[PDB]
Subunit: 114 residues, 2 copies
């Protein structure tokens, strides 16, 4: 149900016990809405049968994510609709939602070319 | 700057020292994206020269907001685009952003008719 999904999102967010640098470092790429949202994505073919959302940070935390990503060599992409969609619907430390498969694959095709 | 605005959002969210019932009780109306976002709006002509955002809650917290609102007689409206826009851009305990003046006035015209 949408209500249970909401409970799961909140819970999996709260149970996470990682600091920001650790979360950025363990990601493959960060998708961001500048000054608003940063979402970490882990995908290793694999390793990971699907991409996983590793973190969500918002507002001023995004600047800090950008800084750490540059330090740790993790690429950050501006992908406003994807970042918003993952923010609303993804569970942290779970595979990406079905609805974001196409958009996430597009990001990861980009990452593969780097 | 967008960066300073983001710092202000985060700060004003964190400095707030109100519990959920107190926040709902002191609102005039709650605008919600079901299972995702609840935003409290205070407007009293006035009292308040402009509407103020009193709170932001998300995910499973929204169910709790709905419950408390019913208990406390505070109306809740489904207004998905407005709720999202306020979530991203409004500062809690400040007047609503310029961009949401029209949409918020529409909500408050509705409240005035009740």
């Amino acid at each position: 149900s949408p209500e249970i999904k909401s409970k799961r999102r909140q819970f999996h967010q709260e149970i996470q016990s990682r600091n920001m640098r650790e979360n950025v470092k363990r990601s493959s790429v960060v998708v961001a809405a500048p000054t608003h949202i940063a979402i970490g994505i882990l995908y290793k073919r694999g390793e990971t049968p699907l991409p996983l959302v590793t973190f969500k940070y918002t507002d001023a935390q995004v600047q800090t994510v950008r800084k750490i990503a540059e330090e740790e060599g993790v690429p950050i992409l501006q992908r406003i609709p994807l970042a918003r969609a993952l923010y609303w619907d993804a569970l942290v430390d779970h595979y990406i939602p079905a609805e974001q498969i196409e958009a996430t694959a597009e990001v990861l095709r980009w990452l593969e070319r780097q």
